Paper text:
Alkaline Phosphatase (AP) and other nonspecific phosphatases are some of Nature's most impressive catalysts, achieving preferential transition state over ground state stabilization of more than 1022-fold while utilizing interactions with only the five atoms attached to the transferred phosphorus. We tested a model that AP achieves a portion of this preference by destabilizing ground state binding via charge repulsion between the anionic active site nucleophile, Ser102, and the negatively charged phosphate monoester substrate. The results show that the Pi trianion binds with an exceptionally strong femtomolar affinity in the absence of Ser102, show that its binding is destabilized by ≥108-fold by the Ser102 alkoxide, and provide direct evidence for ground state destabilization.
To reduce the Pi affinity of the Ser102 mutants to a measurable range, an additional mutation was introduced. Previous studies showed that mutation of Arg166, which interacts with two of the phosphoryl oxygen atoms, reduces Pi binding affinity by ∼103-fold at pH 8.0 ( = 460 µM and  = 640 µM,;  = 0.5–1 µM,). The mutations that remove Ser102 increase affinity by ∼103-fold, providing additional strong support for a destabilizing influence of Ser102. However, the orientation of Pi bound to WT AP and the Ser102Gly and Ala mutants is indistinguishable. The Pi binding geometry in the S102G/R166S AP double mutant, solved herein, is also indistinguishable from that in WT AP. Comparisons of X-ray crystal structures of AP with and without Ser102 reveal the same active site and Pi binding geometry upon removal of Ser102, suggesting that the destabilization does not result from a major structural rearrangement upon mutation of Ser102.
Residue numbers in the entry:
A (entry chain A), B (entry chain B): 4 to 448
The structure:
């Protein structure tokens, strides 16, 4: 069970065979990649919106066309999975999912309607993979660059009828069957605190300033409630670093931003005819992203350091969330940079799994998104931008699917990749619900 | 070695686990797909423009969201491959390839510039896989639904500086160094007639009416040259069925249309705000396609029959050409119908390979295209269309990347899948030029 140690172009891309990514026959190395033994641990990295177009754009920009991601591209067992949602009313396929339905699909193994967290079309709760791991005595972690109430982390720890039900105020008014004062389990935040994973790291500090409307902690802020229940609170990179354990007695909660955590790269918004009317853009670092905000990789390493102390095993989900968020924003530099943030975190996970030898690492996305790579001279009706790549060549990206100021998701099947025990369950055509069952079987749940 | 006999949804898509495509662990089934033994035959099926988006849109429409292509989705060993071209002047990546450069990349194993057939950026001729297979003593076939001078068939049999150089008339004017009356190898058609593949089936009849400017067949039509050299010429489905053998004495040449062969399904072109302003479309049969035109599946059937008499082995390429041609045209019914036509041919190929036991079948595209699956209510700046699927739900497709008649290719890496000996070399991230070297090492050339 190796990783792909290198799959860049092997020489001159203008000569015969110098664009090859393979040195020799792969049959031998693939046989050695196929193990059916238990997974002691699972690390699931999700790139929100990170379909094949978004993977290719970021490789082309940051590593060159012939380049190779030392995390993202290093996982040997690849396939394509479908992530279609359901219409709540009919029960038939909705071909473009949101993040709540898609994340619910892998977390719970049941399809659902757009905006649903941990509930089916019938609005009934199902147990998540995190919840099942915790019941089994495994350590758990939920890490995201987004608000911890974002669809992607919330799907592991909350069951609500709409994904907008962050805190009491919104839950009371949009998920009244889930609201705490109507006898429901609570808001996404209140449920997150009931879920009590060992490590929970991301943004979303703001909704912890809400007070509970009922229950044991009525009048307490949710920040105060977390502390009342014995959670360790950390707010920055130095405090995250200094935590020495995390468990059911001292569960860790890192709140690293008010909303979403700040993206690493800056560049202009793509504009109508923007590849024709602007100079090619080079991305810079984001000079508002303070140095004390931990990166996705730093959060991953600390999570692995704490979780790997449970001898029975652990389950860890890590989301590179603002890939999607910038793809909505039509901001190529932000998008590509957040794909780089995810590559770094994959490397940490893959490095871990090489050493430990019984960990299953899975890298995929929740759905496909808007950005396409198009020709230098393309006259498109949407938002475009020319970019200066590592190859010293112009790449143009287009966002062509909305007139309203959010570039929208797409329905294409997209890459899923895996390394370690049970990776075979990712090859060929699968559905996102199969991913729940893959993880279940590998952990012995 | 096993084929994926069924990977549809396994029950109620709304119930727990009823969207699953996997019935149990795949580790053992994937071990039994891995052989290092030599391939006696190869079938390379190319969907022109058939990216993951194109595949998903066609499955959604024709089989349903939880559906499954008995051909396209049945190949067990999957990955993603990169298909970037080069700028001719610089030798740097060009991120969106045409069909000529991409086909040249798998057919010769050297990257090239858009518009190039069988030549590098320096205009130097390189041998193709078809040419090599023949020289090694294996039978050869080249089947396409396009003109036999389209980039995809031409890159197996011609070495010209521009893909426009169809016959003498064009070659003298745009490829004056390859023109026959200047000491060149000839037009695309003239080089096809020289290459002398055992089976060649498609369209492009009209270029055979052009007459030659020099050489042995000066002053006779290219058609007459084909007759004088001992080709069996066939024009319809009845004539094709009547052929009993193909070989170097009697090579077969099927010319089934002036230009491209007619597409199977009809629909309206997508229009600005077409999902909002026009009714949901259901695809019908194409009235303009006589039953005398053989289908891609029928052409594949005959080619397999005639090539399989060579005990030493054969190489066959089959292109579903008009997936791309119609995706350019912003026509969901044309594109989807052609994707289904290709599925039928892939089925023929896998059925052959499962019984013969030493055949390597590969399905992929030359590049990705424009069509995106978007939300029912999308308000896009491009051309949209709502379609009534097999599920009984509306799917919308969007074409958002051009402002001219022709919608444009994209640069996203796309699915590549294989079955049979040496199919392991398709898994992970590969480049299009690796496909050349995979085939070459599979045949032992
Ligand atoms: Zn998402
Ligand atoms: Zn998310
Ligand atoms: Zn989104
Ligand atoms: Zn093409
Ligand atoms: Zn073609
Ligand atoms: Zn094309």
């Amino acid at each position: 069970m190796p990783v792909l140690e290198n799959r860049a172009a092997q020489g001159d891309i203008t000569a015969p065979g110098g664009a090859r990514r393979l040195t020799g026959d792969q049959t031998a190395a693939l046989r050695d990649s196929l193990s059916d033994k238990p997974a002691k641990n699972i690390i699931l990295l999700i790139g929100d919106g990170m379909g094949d177009s978004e993977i290719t754009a970021a490789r082309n920009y940051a590593e060159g066309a012939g380049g190779f991601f030392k995390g993202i591209d290093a996982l040997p067992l690849t396939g394509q999975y479908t992530h279609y949602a359901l219409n709540k009313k009919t029960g038939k396929p909705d071909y473009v999912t949101d993040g709540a339905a898609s994340a619910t699909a892998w977390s719970t193994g049941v399809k659902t309607y757009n905006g649903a967290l941990g509930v089916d079309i019938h609005e009934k709760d199902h147990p998540t993979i995190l919840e099942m791991a915790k019941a089994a005595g495994l350590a758990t972690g939920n890490v995201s660059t987004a608000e911890l109430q974002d669809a992607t982390p919330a799907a592991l720890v909350a069951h609500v009828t709409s994904s907008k039900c962050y805190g009491p105020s919104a839950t009371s008014e949009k998920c009244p069957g889930n609201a705490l004062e109507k006898g429901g389990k609570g808001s996404i935040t209140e449920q997150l605190l009931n879920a009590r994973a060992d490590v929970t790291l991301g943004g979303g500090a703001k909704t912890f300033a809400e007070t509970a409307t009922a229950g044991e902690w009525q009048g307490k802020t949710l920040r105060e409630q977390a502390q009342a229940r014995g959670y360790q609170l950390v707010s920055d990179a130095a405090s995250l670093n200094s935590v020495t354990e995390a468990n059911q007695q001292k569960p860790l909660l890192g709140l690293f931003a008010d909303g979403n955590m700040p993206v690493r790269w800056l560049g202009p918004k793509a504009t109508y005819h923007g590849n024709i009317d602007k100079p090619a853009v080079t991305c810079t670092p984001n000079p508002q992203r303070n140095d004390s905000v931990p990166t996705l990789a730093q959060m991953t390493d600390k999570a692995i350091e704490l979780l790997s102390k449970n001898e029975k095993g652990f389950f860890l989900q890590v989301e590179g969330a603002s890939i999607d968020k910038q793809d909505h924003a039509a901001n190529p530099c932000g998008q590509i940079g957040e794909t780089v943030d995810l590559d770094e975190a994959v490397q940490r996970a893959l490095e871990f799994a090489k050493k430990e030898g019984n960990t299953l690492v899975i890298v995929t996305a929740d759905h496909a998104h808007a950005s396409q790579i198009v020709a230098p001279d393309t006259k498109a009706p949407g938002l475009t931008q020319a970019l200066n790549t590592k190859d010293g060549a112009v790449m143009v990206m287009s966002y062509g699917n909305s007139e309203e100021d959010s570039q929208e998701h797409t329905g294409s099947q997209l890459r899923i990749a895996a390394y370690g025990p049970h990776a075979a369950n990712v090859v060929g055509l699968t559905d996102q619900t199969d991913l729940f069952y893959t993880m279940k079987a590998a952990l012995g749940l």
